Amino acid sequence: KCETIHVAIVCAGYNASRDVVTLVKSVLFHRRNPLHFHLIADSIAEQILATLFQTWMVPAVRVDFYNADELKSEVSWIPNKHYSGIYGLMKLVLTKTLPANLERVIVLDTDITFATDIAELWAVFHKFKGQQVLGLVENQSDWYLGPWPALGRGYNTGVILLLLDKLRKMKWEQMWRLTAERELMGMLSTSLADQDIFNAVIKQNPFLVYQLPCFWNVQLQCVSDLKVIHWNKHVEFFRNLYLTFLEYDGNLLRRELFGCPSEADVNSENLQKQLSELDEDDLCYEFRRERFTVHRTHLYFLHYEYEPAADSTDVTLVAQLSMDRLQMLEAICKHWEGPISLALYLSDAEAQQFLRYAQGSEVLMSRHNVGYHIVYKEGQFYPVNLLRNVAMKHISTPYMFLSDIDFLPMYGLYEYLRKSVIQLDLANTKKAMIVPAFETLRYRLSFPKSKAELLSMLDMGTLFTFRYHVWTKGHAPTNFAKWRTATTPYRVEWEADFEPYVVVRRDCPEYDRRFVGFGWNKVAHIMELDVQEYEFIVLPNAYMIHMPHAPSFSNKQYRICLKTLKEEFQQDMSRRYGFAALKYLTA
Amino acid sequence: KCETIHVAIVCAGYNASRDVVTLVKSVLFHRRNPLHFHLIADSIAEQILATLFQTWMVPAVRVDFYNADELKSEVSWIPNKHYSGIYGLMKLVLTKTLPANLERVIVLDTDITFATDIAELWAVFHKFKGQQVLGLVENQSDWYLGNLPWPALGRGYNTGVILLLLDKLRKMKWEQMWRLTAERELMGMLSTSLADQDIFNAVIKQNPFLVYQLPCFWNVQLSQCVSDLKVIHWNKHVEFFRNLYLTFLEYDGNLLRRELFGCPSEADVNSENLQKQLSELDEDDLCYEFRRERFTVHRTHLYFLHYEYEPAADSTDVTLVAQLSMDRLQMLEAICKHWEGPISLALYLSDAEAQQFLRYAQGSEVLMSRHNVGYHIVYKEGQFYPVNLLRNVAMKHISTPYMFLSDIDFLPMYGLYEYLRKSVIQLDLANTKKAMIVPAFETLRYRLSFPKSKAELLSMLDMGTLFTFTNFAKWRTATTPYRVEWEADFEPYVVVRRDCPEYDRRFVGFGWNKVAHIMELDVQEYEFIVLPNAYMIHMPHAPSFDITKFNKQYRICLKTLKEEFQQDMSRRYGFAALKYLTA
Ligand SMILES: *[C@@H]1O[C@H](CO)[C@@H](O)[C@H](O)[C@H]1NC(C)=O
Ligand SMILES: *[C@@H]1O[C@H](CO)[C@@H](O)[C@H](O)[C@H]1NC(C)=O
Ligand SMILES: [Mn+2]
Ligand SMILES: [Mn+2]
């Protein structure tokens, strides 16, 4: 029928989070039933996958999280060759942690790929008989034939089918615990973690197992017949399946399936709401719809480790990019030694291309303090403020430096900003520190190593003020004339369309998502800063340089619609704040 | 069983060719039986689809072509408001054109998508009874029920999906039957609005016993009856069906090369030679992947977009030839602004990227205004950028006697096209083996004012904003084309006769690909002539993913491929080759 199929997965860390996304893409493509994922996760996986599934909005898919750390005390007495083995052991205790009403589940490891509809494997449960409660595929390796005890060749636990009711009725907890203790007296440690334990139980209790055909867990023989693949001539085809699912557009999987009632979690309810309230006749409909659009988000795509800073002064460089600016990553890493947060607007293919590039970069693999957040492409305009908000929400520091992927910061800018947060008393007062922005017209080989070199180059016409030839306003309030000779930080007041690059405390106002596509977004943000009486201080020894780039993908209606978005922003601001808004409209 | 299912499709033109590839993807994803396609095609479709199925190498799939142009006289007497309707009319004559041994077929239109195994529809033939020979789904529009009309029975029927019992149709003298009906109706109605469909309906009006009505769900006309829907007919609830269409558009066609699990096929001979060549290789060699990719066959889709070439009066027309990946799509409009003559492009894409490119072109006025650009899709496969396969695909399929072998990242000078034509006449390229060199420069400025004369070019060089990409002084001041000799690692951009030697397919990835090509031109005694007034400029761009590929072993293997080229050259030619080794 439309019965819901229940899938339990243990997943800890960043790699497992990626891998489970790939598994889930595989199940969804061929699925025809509702799905309920029970993710037993550590804190890292729980955060990443929680946000991921919230923003994915897959119809008819429920996801429950179970804290895996709170489970280690159940299996930590069983020694393992690899510490990660403890997570494997946790399958043994699913009967305890899963809800009591849940009668049967399919357990999968993260390196499993589906090649068919999961309803078939789920249907195999009906062929169980009597005291059969475990469904497993023979271990296709000769590990147990030549080592913990096993029944014949033994069984692989990458794919397990559990009758939870019967397992609870048989008091499975006591049984596997006794078996484990009894065998652990002789064998000192488990090599293959849960797998070992399971085989011993099935060896001791050969009535428990129902052997699944080889083809429900193809451990990489028996291409039509192969249905579930397990990684560790026909290999090239399956590697192409795996690559096909890595790169397959997750957004295509939001497809609804009738016959079955769908569930719109809570975010989908409100999205449907907002898209209904809209005026379809209005010619800026795409702008309003992308004001409310929800993108798949995969936080912390790569391994991440932040080292707690002594001071409460640490600063994160925050930026966003699409694939055409991948070239900037390493450059920034050479110039900025502190933590970095990046929102990357990619397609799934581009996400995996980025994966390969980053793993093949010495600088990127040596940096563990850069969080790379993937916002998957959707719709027609570059959601610059969505991206900025995603990057700036997920930082590990009290202060952040809001930059572009296209600037290279001054060498030593990071430590200088920390000294500045101390010097300008950013801990006790509401201030926005400005980093003066300059530009170059072609890539250069010697980067200025001092403000004196900066000034010499500027006097030769090889460096210029940022956007100097198009919008001299926007950075003119910085006053580069007095910055030139200044030695003390100095205060500047707000002017129309002013758009500096600032370092601020992390809980500052976010960007307004109504301004999709290229427009007056940063200007609106700076106005938001100025109403809340953020003080604009220019730093006498800081600077950043914009690298030249080709334009990225100008209809008259688009100009008109931006103008209407600007108007509606000023009107929501007049209502939002009050008399304070007036000094900005006269601009 | 392993019984073969026969599918006949009428396809003319470029749009139809893309659409039929989509149809075939959807059939292959669900098929479990061998397949035999009967493609009734105009010349364009025959060229396109012949190459596509040759390179696709789908197991257990046979493809026969029937020249549709030689069939026009069968139906041209039936006037239509659309000339394209003529190809529709050709369904009426399948009993004549399909082979005599062929008992039954499924006829499909190009805009059909399958959602299930085609053997189910094929089995529906067994429910036919008595004098029934035509299987059709009711027409879901109200076209025949009112003024929005040819005679029809009730709703009428949709002709996008038809089941034909060819034996009984031949015994019934079906040709005279529908012809009689067409003429009788044609005396009253002056022309057909919907072509073959009308005539079919007229027959069913006159002969209501012929039809077996298929359920609506074998031909869902979209312009309700979701699990039960099996075949979709294209023309809120839309998003589900467009997502199926997107899912088949984006599916990796190469995955459909999987073997038929129950039935042994023979994969013609293109797989026979691929298998031979991949067996003869030495797997112990550390450049095995390069050698394996020397012979890989990539799925190829020539003329992915509408193409229309205007025959040149004189025999001097030149084609700009180039290759690109998705990351350089931005360049197309620029090249079209600089080169008004014909263009042939090899695009190394995935299926998703191919459909994204379709969208991009559909939204570009400069690209839609140009009908003289051929877009050839070489679908990605393997590990290295098959640059010379790409160049060869692009340069073989041109419409002109001469070709300009360029790179996607240069913009040619304005008016280069006419200059090259005038040059082929003055340098007598019709009677002699010559390679005209187009001097290539480069800029590091991203906001460049493109020089509109050689004098402006030279000033920009004198101010340091342009630089070379020989005696530049001889070119600087030259006014006559001049001859230059070959030198080590020589690599100019040349305009040559269309039958010059092709690129050597062993050079996968970036290395001595062009060096070897130019070296071939020099052994076959082409003259290198520099044009004094031609030039093209390299525009700065973000790097591609070549930047990732270029492992130590990859450097070693590229140098090894150069060595092996020189060695095969010494064997093929002789002492004339030695002067290139001494370099
Ligand atoms: C996770 O993958 C990264 C590279 O993608 C690797 O450096 C790291 O060691 C992996 N973590 C493991 C194997 O625990
Ligand atoms: C072919 O399809 C394209 C869509 O890309 C359309 O713009 C064009 O008008 C079509 N031409 C014909 C003759 O159907
Ligand atoms: Mn910029
Ligand atoms: Mn280039």
Numbering used by the authors:
A (entry chain B): 134 to 279, 287 to 360, 368 to 369, 373 to 382, 392 to 712, 719 to 752
B (entry chain A): 134 to 281, 287 to 361, 368 to 369, 373 to 382, 392 to 625, 637 to 717, 720 to 752
Quote the study that presented this structure, word for word.
Like-acetylglucosaminyltransferase 1 (LARGE1) is a bifunctional glycosyltransferase (GTase) that plays a critical role in maintaining proper muscle function. This enzyme is responsible for a post-translational modification on the extracellular matrix receptor, α-dystroglycan (α-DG), which enables it to interact with proteins containing a laminin-G domain. The polysaccharide which LARGE1 synthesizes, termed matriglycan, is composed of xylose (Xyl) and glucuronic acid (GlcA) subunits in a linear repeating structure of [-3GlcA-β1,3-Xyl-α1-]n. LARGE1 is present in the Golgi as a type II membrane protein, composed of a transmembrane/cytosolic region, a predicted coiled-coil/stem (CC), and domains with xylosyltransferase (Xyl-T) and glucuronyltransferase (GlcA-T) catalytic activities, which are separated by a linker.
While obtaining the single-particle EM data, we also managed to crystallize the LARGE1ΔCC and to collect X-ray diffraction data, extending to 2.6 Å. The crystal of LARGE1 belonged to a C 2 space group, and we found two copies of LARGE1 in the asymmetric unit. For both chains (i.e., A and B), electron density was visible and hence allowed us to model residues 134 to 752. Despite the fact that we have crystallized the LARGE1ΔCC construct, the two chains in the asymmetric unit formed a parallel dimer that resembles the EM map of the LARGE1ecto. Indeed, the crystallographic dimer readily fits into the EM density map of the LARGE1ecto. Inspection of the parallel dimer interface shows an overall buried surface area of 2,589 Å2 (1,350 Å2 on chain ‘A’ and 1239 Å2 on chain ‘B’). In the active site of the Xyl-T domain, we could not detect a clear density that would indicate the presence of a divalent cation. In the electron density map, we observed density for a coordinated ion in the active site of the GlcA-T domain and we therefore modeled a Mn2+ atom, which is an essential metal for the activity of LARGE1. The LARGE1 GlcA-T domain has an extra histidine (His708) that seems to participate in the binding of the Mn2+. Interestingly, the closest Xyl-T and GlcA-T sites in the context of the LARGE1 dimer are located on opposite monomers rather than on a single protomer.
